[PDB]
Amino acid sequence: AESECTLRALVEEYNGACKEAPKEMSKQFTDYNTFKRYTTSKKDHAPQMRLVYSVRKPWPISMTPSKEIPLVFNGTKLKDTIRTRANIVVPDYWSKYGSQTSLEVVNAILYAEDLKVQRFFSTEWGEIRYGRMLPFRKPVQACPTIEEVNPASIPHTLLQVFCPQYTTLDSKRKAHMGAVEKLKRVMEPICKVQTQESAVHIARSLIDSNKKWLPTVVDHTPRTAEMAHFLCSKYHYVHTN
Amino acid sequence: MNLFTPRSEINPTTTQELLYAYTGPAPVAYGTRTRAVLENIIRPYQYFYKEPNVQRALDIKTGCKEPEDINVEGPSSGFHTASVLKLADNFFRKYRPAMEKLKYWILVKLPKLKYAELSKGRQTYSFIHKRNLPAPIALEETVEFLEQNLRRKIGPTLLSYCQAIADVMELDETTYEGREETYTIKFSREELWDQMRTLNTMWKHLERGRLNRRTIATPSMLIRGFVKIVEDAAKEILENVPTSGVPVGGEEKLAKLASKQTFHTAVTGELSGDQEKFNECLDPDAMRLMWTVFLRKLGCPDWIMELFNIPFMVFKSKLADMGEGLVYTKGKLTDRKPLGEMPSEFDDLVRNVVGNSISCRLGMFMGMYNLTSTLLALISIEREELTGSHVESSDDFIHFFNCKTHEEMFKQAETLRLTLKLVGINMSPSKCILISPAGIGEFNSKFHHRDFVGNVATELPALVPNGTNPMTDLAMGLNVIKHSVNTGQMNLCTGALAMRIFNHAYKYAYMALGVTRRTRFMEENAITPLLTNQGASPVHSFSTMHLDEVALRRHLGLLDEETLRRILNPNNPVTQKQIMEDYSVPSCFKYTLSRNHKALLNKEERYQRVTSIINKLFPEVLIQEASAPGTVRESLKRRLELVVERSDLDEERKKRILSRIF
Amino acid sequence: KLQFSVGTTFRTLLKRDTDWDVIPTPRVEPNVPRIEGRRWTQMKKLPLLKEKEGPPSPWRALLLGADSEYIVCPPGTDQEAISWIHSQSEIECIRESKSTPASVITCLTSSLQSFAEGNPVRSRIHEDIIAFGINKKQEKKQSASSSASGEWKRAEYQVEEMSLPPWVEEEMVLLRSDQEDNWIELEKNAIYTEVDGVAEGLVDKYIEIVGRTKVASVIEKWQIAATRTFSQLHTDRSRITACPIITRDPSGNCQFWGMVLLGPHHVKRDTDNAPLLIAEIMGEDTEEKYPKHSVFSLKVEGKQFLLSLKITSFSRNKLYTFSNIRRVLIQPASIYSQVVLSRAAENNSLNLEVNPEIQLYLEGAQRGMTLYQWVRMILCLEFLMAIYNNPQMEGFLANMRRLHMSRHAMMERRQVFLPFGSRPEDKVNECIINNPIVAYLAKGWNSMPNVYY
């Protein structure tokens, strides 16, 4: 039933697209790359300056037209039903009274961050040293990754993980098999149904090992390069495992 | 100032960061830029000849002069053709691996460049609406104009875009047809040429370290493809040239040169300086000649040379935007009048005046050809008597001489100065300082002392939330402080203090510090503060500047399973969707603030809906660049049919769904 | 024709303002000629900056600096403290400057009264026309139009050169005076590693060093005033808004530094200037230092204070920048930390309770001073520079970094050589016009020796 409802909604959206945007619908598909970044807002150069005013507005947050959030709670007006508008207290209220998702979803979302936290807390630190140490910056891997996957094959790996049936066989043989297998294993529960926008980013952060210029008193492994921001500062050197 | 000059414990070089008064407001340019633009336009003509003859210099098409005309006691505004050719040949012969990498880039990477990247540029002056519009809007308008006039579909590649731009120039006339309002505008060939060659000039705002304000210039979208191609080639060649500081971070090469030493017998010297009137003393013809020499010696075909030379030639016939006009005062009143209405210090240019733009041949403008200017400066160094280590970034430069005697060092420094003049670059005599023996200097805000290169930022990190949302703002601020810490600027104490200040500002910005609506609401409902933006104590530390707030709190036990389930619930209604990565998890606190010509906002909303439907229906465009043979309609129809026909629903339900499709 | 082709018409268009074809093929034999160069002279002695001559530079900052004071009030809310101050007040004019007429005091009191009822926003009555320059642009334009005669001339702008005022030294001296309580209160970060502990200890020691100074109090006052004015910048846009500067002492007693009013501002751009009627408590009044302020005598509980009114106009960007004024603490901190971290590196043992001797070119017989005093003075000078940051300061510092590097090179007996016709002092001097802090820095530079053997 859910699939049928989603397909009906997609058909309604197709009607809206073909009826309201006949001119845009006839442009080249690659033209997407041009108008996916379409934006009339200028480069503000100072959103932090307007943040204070925006937060203190009567209805700063824009929320989807949901029904779980009551219109009025303990006298406070939580939402403005005409996407509807809601005040900054809504996220705080949701943190106490709100719908609860499965623990599997929570584990999947936090997989990268939880792994980073465990990696930080799963290692010991040696006696901190002090001296005239020269921190010659070098380009090293930023964060440890699931498996060694070439940057060229990263998009193919993501495609195989998410929608393997929409890619060519030659492309199917351009992605790491272990990485795709385990990423599909850990990203399966609910991250791979509709919340693809964040799931793809999490997967990329898991497999994509971006190189960065970091200070290295000694040769740095990705595990150390993750936390190199405090291992050495030209005046000290903390030795890890 | 005597306080900033220690003679014990630490050295004055360490106190250099004290001379940076960035904590105060940055200067902002006011009102008209016509005076600055006109001064920039006139400087090359004044400096072309030793005697400031402007009328005679204004008649020069290509600015080239013999060495006798080159000014040694002042700036020069021209180049020597034979010297440019010889220096380009020497540069090609010296850095052959870089030339081979450039050849590979041309033969492989260049054809695959998509013009969609042009949407990532700065503000562009649209020649259709006669207004400044963002890069995506100008690019879409230009592509539509090309499609309408050429009666063909522009290819996804950038070379196809350049070919279309060249083709539309042949037509005698062009036409463009665009709340609801229909309007058709017709341009002549000369009008389109003027729009293509016209530059848009604007004040450079919030620039520090300068007493006098200066302007920057940007080209029109018509010529942005060629400029992008040339700049990409320049970046590719520069990334493999040891003498450069733009793409390699700058600090690495300066540190490498600092680490170098000698046999404590050879005379060493360190010349650090800038170039005076760098952009007002370069001729585009010199750069195009250098590029032609590079390509010709590379064996490239004729069309490549034509493509690389077109942008420089179009820049030669530039129509700089004067702006609002010059200011005149009849006592206490003030009026703004364009050049040529009343006598002024720039009367010599009244001849080269158009409706509101001034035609200029000699000189350039800052912010348009940076990598090409760097290459022009670098080819000069490739002499037979310049055995030293030179690093140049656009304008700043540092040269390490290692000679056998002081007289040889002076001769080499003078040879460097004269060669830079030869190409058309004048090192500022006042801002150029040579220190012997070497071991002290500055370059690109990085100060080198003996064997230590300390990086000093032009501005301290903005210890304020960006303005997106609590989680994203916290992650971005922590990442910025971490980047400042690991780049050598901030140490343990400075980093921790900056984090404390940022935490205070971040808590204040989100109404979680004193008695506010958020805190009062949380207290009245017994909502225990669990996150930093909620008023809870800062869980982050100096070591844990990279861990996520939610993950760290969960590990420490500050967040329980039920709270995490309620927060990270993907069904909550308050979340939707280079060196600024954001690794914050999509929690309920990752919301968006409601931020709130009429014929363009509707188009933007329509495109937003189209891209949203594509994203939900095409679960492949978020992983790879969009690509499919055909238009949007064909691909969307195929994908929708495949999705619907692959479902497990019964035949009747499938037919019901399909029938509703328009 | 292969991949890219240029038509004949476009070729002719391109070959319009150049001497070569689309592919330049100049017919010249490539070689590098020899040009008669010049001699590279040596900077035997460091230069001396130009000390301007003119009227002493007044205090042109937004709020008061070292002279700022506060009134102690019983613990309570800002409304309670404002009501307590207003109820017991005998404000009377003492020195009325034509720039800030004394009548404008009526605006301040009417605001305080309005703040004692719980409504900071107040409506204009009579005195806001001159207090905030309402409809002043039209008046100036009409006056200029009615007095128009002559011929248009290229507008000439001149910056009135001024000399070093004698109050910069006094401000520097009074800014580093010790206080009773700590004025820097920042929530500490969590500690999970020895590195975190060391960083927190260093930050705590720095705050202890610079926390109990007058400069810290002035920084807190500036931060509070800027934050409260910037926050209430679009509250009403048509009525006078009250933004009192009130702090809480550890005992809980309120401290009233002053009062900032916002006029009926009509702000469109981010660089526009909104009017203000800053009213602040002084400690000592000098006519030559505050020629535009108007000083009144305010009596509270028998005690007497001076209240200075100024008619200012400040931009949104400047208010936002001064809201985050705490960043001024970052620059000195590093210099302190490095010194500490310099002592730990030479013996592989950290020591937070270390303040070695820093030698300096001091006017008196003193050879130098201690790390704590030097850091306090650095914080004071950096705060003054930040307050007085304008294009003159930017250019002066940018062009004085070169001379600082040259001085450091001379200190190590490194010969500094210069090109032909080079005058870095010429670049530095053009930035010395009015800025009193720039003049103070130039005097300090001139004080130090210019010859090193």
Place this chain on the structure above:
RNA sequence: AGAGAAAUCAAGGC
């Protein structure tokens, strides 16, 4: 008035 510095704000458009 005032802010400010090489030209603007001290409200603009229709």
Place this chain on the structure above:
RNA sequence: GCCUG
């Protein structure tokens, strides 16, 4: 006289 900020 109407309206944005």
